[PDB]
């Protein structure tokens, strides 16, 4: 289940950076940006393989790619945020 | 992010000195000159560890290394100036 909706203004600033890159189709910072997200634990609605893609939300100060990501679906504005390495997800509302 | 591009002629003259030292591979005035810049805060573009190196830009009259630095990237002509101790950066244009 999606844990609720979250305003874009409420997320770390880097979430806005990632969304802008998704909009332009990069170029992206990490080679893993844009890979298919398999939704193995069925946290997000069940879809055919390939429906979902994942992108890094940079965490300043981290030594790795970290745990923050944006998962996109095929619907318009269907963008989900996870700050906990896919445990929980929120749908992003870009109007607030 | 990078703030914009600045002509070398518009920076303190000590920046010109540091670039000249970088071109000749020293010798450098400070032992910290040439160490890897980790870009821990992700202000500059994400790159592999060792892509960036830091060099002192002398501040006239200072007893310490001060706050001015040039950060080199591995790409041709990729050099960044900071006058505020890595808070903000501008790309150096050596052609003007």
Swiss-Prot record, chains A, B:
UniProt-annotated catalytic positions: 54 (proton acceptor), 85 (proton donor)
Main location: secreted
Pfam families membership: Ribonuclease
Record keywords: Disulfide bond, Endonuclease, Hydrolase, Lyase, Nuclease, Secreted
Subcellular location(s) per record: Secreted
Lineage top rank: taxon: Bacteria
CDD domains to which the protein is assigned, alphabetical: RNase_Sa
Keyword Phosphoprotein assigned: no
Enzyme Commission identifier(s): 4.6.1.24
Disulfide bond positions: 7-96
Keyword Disulfide bond: yes
Recorded GO MF terms: lyase activity; ribonuclease T1 activity; RNA binding; RNA endonuclease activity
GO cellular component labels: extracellular region
Enzyme's top EC category: lyase
Effect of residue 39 to A/D/S: Decreases protein stability
Catalyzed chemical reaction(s): [RNA] containing guanosine + H2O = an [RNA fragment]-3'-guanosine-3'-phosphate + a 5'-hydroxy-ribonucleotide-3'-[RNA fragment]
Gene3D superfamilies attached to this UniProt entry: Microbial ribonucleases
Family, similarity comment: Belongs to the ribonuclease N1/T1 family.
Protein name: Guanyl-specific ribonuclease Sa
Organism of origin: Kitasatospora aureofaciens
Organism taxonomic ancestry: Bacteria, Bacillati, Actinomycetota, Actinomycetes, Kitasatosporales
Gene of this entry: rnaSA
